[PDB]
From a paper:
Here, we solved the structure of the 1E6 TCR with 7 altered peptide ligands (APLs) determined by our previously published combinatorial peptide library (CPL) screening, 2 of which mapped within human pathogens. Ligand engagement is dominated by peptide interactions, but hotspot-like interactions with the central GPD motif enable the 1E6 TCR to tolerate peptide residues that vary outside of this region, explaining how T cells expressing this TCR may cross-react with a large number of different peptides.
The unligated structures of A2-AQWGPDAAA, A2-RQWGPDPAAV, A2-YQFGPDFPIA, and A2-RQFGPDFPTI were virtually identical when in complex with 1E6. Furthermore, the structures of the unligated pMHCs demonstrated that, for these stronger-affinity ligands, there was less conformational difference between the TCR ligated pMHCs compared with the weaker-affinity ligands. At the other end of the spectrum, the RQFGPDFPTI peptide stimulated MIP-1β release and killing by 1E6 at an exogenous peptide concentration 2–3 logs lower compared with ALWGPDPAAA.
Residue numbers in the entry:
A (entry chain C): 1 to 10
B (entry chain A): 0 to 276
C (entry chain B): 0 to 99
Write the structure that this text describes.
Amino acid sequence: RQFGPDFPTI
Amino acid sequence: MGSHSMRYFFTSVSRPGRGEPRFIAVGYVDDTQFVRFDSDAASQRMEPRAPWIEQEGPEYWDGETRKVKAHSQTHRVDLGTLRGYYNQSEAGSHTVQRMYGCDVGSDWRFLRGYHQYAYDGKDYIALKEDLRSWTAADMAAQTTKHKWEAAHVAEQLRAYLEGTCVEWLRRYLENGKETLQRTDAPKTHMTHHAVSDHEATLRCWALSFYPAEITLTWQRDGEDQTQDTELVETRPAGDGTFQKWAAVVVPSGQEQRYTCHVQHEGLPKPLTLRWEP
Amino acid sequence: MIQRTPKIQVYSRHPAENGKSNFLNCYVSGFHPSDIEVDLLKNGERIEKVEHSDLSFSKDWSFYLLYYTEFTPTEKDEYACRVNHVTLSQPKIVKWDRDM
Ligand SMILES: [Ca+2]
């Protein structure tokens, strides 16, 4: 089960 | 099989001449790949790579596809930001990589979590073991660190890595039990190769093992020997198991002084092999 | 940026027995960047139905891939893996040795 909802941008 | 991990790996490679970055994601439990996403594949979905995940229902596959596509777009943005941070030409291809995941102990309780990020194959930013702070490699990544601190990113990751990550790893271990909780001890044997009239190579083999972690060592008269030895990198057999060998060069006729010692999770006690054929 | 050249092992899945079906593997690892060309060869000629694993990477960020095909070893036929990568000035060929 992936992390969500999303990764922040660098 | 004692201790376990779930890990996700992401690679994005820019394509300056035309179009979006190539993006490849893979998920593992231990040394078993269970899902993939490839931006160049036709399905445009997260796909199963192990039989035990195929039982998850459509809400699972929809969710995991939505996340992984979102993640791909984050890396697409990052490649453009990083090009600018590093003052690089728009002509070149560059690479982002991310890995994150969690480990549990034999008790299946949380042990540690991790999240790290690289640009062009070098460390960029990583979460520290406390899951509260960040390690930035250079001044570009230091800007990222301040951004992510302001946004409380560590706290979100931490909740996932100590919570959801562990709970789903445990669900996978018990759904894929007949393989994921099976240890395959190495099938071992020794071969002999005359080099000249006066010296020979003994090669110790470990085959068809799982997980991949293993230790092969040579001893002469009961003491460790590394000189005049060779050890190949552990390699996949293609059927889910692993292979490795170690070799030593010995004076022909003195083969019996040498022993191969094999350590692996699937072995209650290490194996010792000796040329006595 | 950093460029790392691939390590290459060529081996069978099962112990080689002349005349008996098996799988020929070429494991490439330790490389960066990820674009790589890999062919399996029989008597110098490119084998067509070759499959490969999904790209992944190690703790040092270097990539690894397995390329493989069904094959039948014999006494006379030579098998090899041919690899090209930005770090190589010419493709590198590694011959299969059934004892390694
Ligand atoms: Ca080249």
